[PDB]
Symmetry: D2
């Protein structure tokens, strides 16, 4: 994890969220006439994270009320935590930390997206071998490869924005979700509290309805899945025998993605929570979510750093493109010779010349020139042109433009 994400989920931002929730609750309930107005004023003033005795801290939030109610003057502590249950404070605090977490994620995605836009543009036309099952296939450009990551990271951005409206929601339902101890002021307290914390008011309690938190986990799984692919591709291209790129780090992403994807499965498990309250499933989320958020930030940090100083070697990419000695663009030689020699003789002639060039480990050009019909109907510099892998890039540049233009 990164210091930045690490302290978002520290005990200390956590209770700071607790105190902000208790302070907001007292103001709303004093504004509604539920608690004395002066009591809320004293409670809010002692809602400072610099006033907890960390040494005197079994009871997650109650330990913070015990030091709040027994801290205020004239028993004005009476009145904090009025009508709230423990999970109301934990889950709304968790929601606040998620929003802080996703702020970092959005910033990391922006830098990554920007790095990819630059790499896609810079290396728009740098030829390299595309690879299928780690075997060379047909030529592409490195910029084309980067544009495919860019489009994926943009889709992830869309997913992040879509879940925020569901996830950024208040949890305030009391013991069983109906806020029974507040009478006909429960919904009013809830709706104003959400307001006060800049959170969407809940349509109903969700203490055992964990689709909001699990949806965050599954998004982290989807996102780190893409980061793992980026890390794998980069260390594949920086192999000693490949050497097409160089790191300015990606091995850490692999572990992060593997841990996060299993954590997302655990959060789905937690969705099976019985009746109105369930400690067990709740404890899964209490453990996994901060772990997955920290793993994801480490992966994003490494990917961001690697991409910003990523180093590209077009000489190595061209060298690897030349390994097949013409065979990689055998399809191009088929069509290019179809106008001069006939649609099918071109197919049959280069295919048979392709087998020979393969079995003899010779350039495809050299075997084509051993065909007298080839050597008499079309000269060598036009056959070299067709055998050059750099002349068979397709519409990589226009596909790149299509990604860069939104």
């Amino acid at each position: 994890g990164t210091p930045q994400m690490r302290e978002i989920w520290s005990d200390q931002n956590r209770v700071a969220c607790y105190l902000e929730i208790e302070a907001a609750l007292a103001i709303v309930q004093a504004d509604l006439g539920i608690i004395p107005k002066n009591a809320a004023h004293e409670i809010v003033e002692h809602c400072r994270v610099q006033e907890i005795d960390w040494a005197l801290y079994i009871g997650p939030v109650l330990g913070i009320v015990q030091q709040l109610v027994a801290n205020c003057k004239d028993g004005l502590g009476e009145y904090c935590h009025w009508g709230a249950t423990t999970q109301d404070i934990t889950d709304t605090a968790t929601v606040m930390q998620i929003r802080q977490s996703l702020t970092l994620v959005k910033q990391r995605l922006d830098s990554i997206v920007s790095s990819l836009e630059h790499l896609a543009e810079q290396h728009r036309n740098v030829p390299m071998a595309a690879r299928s099952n780690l075997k060379q296939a047909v030529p592409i450009t490195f910029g084309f490869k980067m544009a495919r990551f860019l489009a994926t990271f943009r889709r992830h951005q869309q997913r992040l924005v879509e879940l925020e409206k569901r996830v950024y929601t208040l949890e305030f339902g009391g013991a069983a979700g109906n806020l029974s101890s507040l009478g006909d002021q429960g919904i009013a307290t809830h709706d104003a509290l959400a307001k006060m914390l800049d959170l969407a008011p809940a349509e109903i309690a969700w203490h055992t309805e964990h689709d909001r938190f699990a949806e965050v986990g599954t998004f982290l799984g989807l996102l780190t899945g893409t980061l793992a692919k980026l890390a794998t591709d980069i260390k594949l291209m920086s192999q000693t025998e490949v050497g097409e790129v160089g790191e300015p780090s990606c091995v850490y992403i692999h572990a992060c993605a593997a841990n996060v994807r299993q954590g997302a499965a655990a959060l789905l498990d937690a969705m099976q929570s019985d009746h109105e309250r369930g400690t067990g499933p709740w404890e899964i989320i209490w453990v996994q979510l901060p772990l997955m958020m920290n793993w994801t930030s480490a992966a994003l940090n490494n990917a961001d750093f690697v991409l910003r100083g990523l180093q590209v070697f077009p000489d190595a990419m061209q060298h690897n493109l030349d390994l097949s000695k013409g065979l990689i663009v055998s399809e191009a030689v088929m069509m290019g010779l179809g106008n001069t020699l006939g649609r099918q003789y071109a197919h049959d002639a280069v295919y048979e010349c392709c087998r020979t060039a393969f079995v003899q480990d010779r350039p495809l050009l050299d075997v084509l020139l051993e065909n007298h019909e080839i050597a008499s109907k079309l000269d060598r510099t036009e056959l070299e042109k067709l055998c050059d892998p750099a002349n068979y890039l397709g519409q990589c540049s226009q596909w790149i433009d299509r990604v860069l233009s939104p």
Copy 2:
């Protein structure tokens, strides 16, 4: 289940294959890529009633060339994964149509149960121990709100998933030259799919996104199933099943692990990868079938659900008033101190518990309380049905969108 197994059959699958091949041949003729003799000849032999049914895409395309007279212009510029993944997208669209219909029925049934049992009192439970009274319609409304969120998640992923995959060997359609993008764009319109911003042969977020949604959806169904068999325990008997929630449990367990496999599959190298691709090809059909089975069972169980309010009333009376000790605290905090009401009535709950007797009987033995409230409701304060909170209004909030 049959409709879901029909979508993912070898044979709806090949029908999807032939439709893509037919549509590709048509657009390629309109753009001047393939001759109009052959394009028209390929369309007729795009019949699943013409596959002789003895064993992927190339096996059906190799027959198709040796099928429509003299056809070898079909599959032009396309790779195998173009056909399989676009067919998978088409099957996902049909799959999600079934899911939308089942969710509609489930949401409608929950709209029932919230209204009927809006005021049916029952004991809420925390760690399977009674807490405070609620209503059965309130419990159903919390399920209804969740399923509505799932519906929104479904619509949101459709715009991404319903996309064409047509990129060729390495995604750049090199064999199509300056007609690659045009062929792609035209194929998408002909299949009513959005054109891709770029190839995604190894970019598996669309397919994994479908899986994680199935995991989120089946997670809620698993909760509904567990709560239902918990409420139908012999010792509880507050509901029943019509006359199969146990089948939902296994469906969700398999779907959630299958989603982890799809996230794993996103780790796919370079431009093509059979390994990770095969994870999706296996798990996605399995997860769809498990989800449809779970949805059908949930739909049927909710469609004819069993409710017994005097079972809930009997269970509410088990603690003999202790479950509504909070209600006595509020009503008694008006005459005494609200905090004094806490400590005095809590102390009464203790003796009422250790001696197994009602809270009403022990409260009357405290001279301070017996002076602030008469006998008649110390009852209704101890009556669990008089401490339901704003359950009915919370239900209205869910029913109104």
Copy 3:
């Protein structure tokens, strides 16, 4: 986490394990003539766990402080021929051995508690449940003996994996200890004997079946703990009240976290070629977490079982809910001798169905059948309707589990 279990996995005990390997390594290489006996003495003295200045370089940072503490340049005879993963993974093995020692102690106490509960409540009748619906009568000791057998099998699994896991990892950069020449195997075998570890048959830096196997065992073990927590807390329902806890909800989360961690460890087995940071770091993270989650689950189960709250009266009350329907099967057998096996079936089944729709005891409805009242009078029909008289061979099955 638990107190004894962090500090096994604390950076302190880890660094202590690092220093023991380096100390043992120097002794081994001095006896073999690889390094001069100065440093074995000087390096061993500075392999104190209270001389380290706290503050990547997991292992390299600790040897840097070992060259910097030793005399006269003697300190760069330490770590000779070793790679970082040799020290980390051998430490992990030592920490796993310390971890499993706790697990065996917890398993012994849990087994001991179940042996007592199986004997105490051997004849305490209760309702068995299928899909959370009552089935036929059993005894509470029968339920406990079934847990006892499972934990005994778990004990067997732990002992079997110990001989594979308690193995040295000392292979150098690529496993062949190139820099040690013809002394590599001799160094390895002597070092393993110095640490009371089995010598490896070969290097296993990217062969993670030993570490993953530990994780799958934790998954199997916490799975049984998760069932125990579910049954106890299903029996502690307000509407059931058959047991009470003296603290099982935590086990549920522990088991769920362990089982996904085990899947991550299996994933880590996909490690390329001779060294792999990616997969190795999965294990570095998951193993300590799963050990602490498992120790917490074992602590709770141990405490809950030792102070288990058992109420036979509630078990008897729940047995009587069906009012004889629970032992309808026994009523047919006793009366099948007189009327015939299935004639008894259909007559009793049809009486049971009637007793259900009328919410009346099965004895009352059976006595309204003139044919049944002719083959058996009341004392016997009511003995047959007593759920306590249809426990099968529960007690004998208890003996089968208790007497090994």
Copy 4:
């Protein structure tokens, strides 16, 4: 993928039902010997306990979810004079399904044992063949130091032997009879329940259970976790083979007369193992939910594993090894890969501390300049004066720094020289 034909046949409806009928037949025989049912009835039941008399239409359709009863209803109504009504006596459905699954697992593990046996033999063969073939070891896909291909094969070989030990160890727990009735106590069998169980177990060549285990799923999950551990090794093998067969590497070649399929198998099997661990959370005495997880995952995991085993067996049997490519890749760093050997070789002639410092920075010089480490070392006037070139060029030879690869292989093969 789909799985091998035998493994597909082991978990087919045909073989499963055949297992049912063997259990019912064995139960009838045991209970006739105990006087619980008449012998003529047991004899008539055994004669009709044959899978070739089952009408698959009545079972495939209209079977409402009756795994065993659909076959028992056809055994009762198949036997003459209503003698079939004596079958299934005292047994519950899960007794028949679980015991059948046990017998199917044993048949499955017979295949796995045979496949592991062949794979081990290929690895012993490959380890011996290429015991001295030099190649570059790789760390994070970067070259590290020289090893031999046989050393790499022996590291797989040692792993599979440990897997073979795990297989044998769980067999004694898994090959167990499940016969406990409705709640595990065989209530309807009275004082004959235990006698029926022990005799039925011996009749099926299974260990008698210590007690019922209808919701105690440690045996089945343990099978799943073993398949996870095993396919994990197979996935590493498939990954290493695909890495060594990259166009830019070309060190091995698959027979192709297959490794990518292993990756998907292992990924699905390891997630299935997690689901089986989840199934262990089964309440009270009977649980359809958790039991159905196992019913689904186990056959899938067995078929995925055999597919992975079949591919690995085939690939290892016809594996093409290219020592020239391995040698070509060893020479890529032009001596940098054995810089450590050059360090040690020069310590006596130059001083061990100068040898470290001088040769180390000569390496980065050779790296940034893309030149042989030999050429840069000769440009060091102190070295070039104490050291002729034919002697440095032995120290710069990657093939002269293999360590004890050969002897480590001996340990794995159990050569008499290893002891």
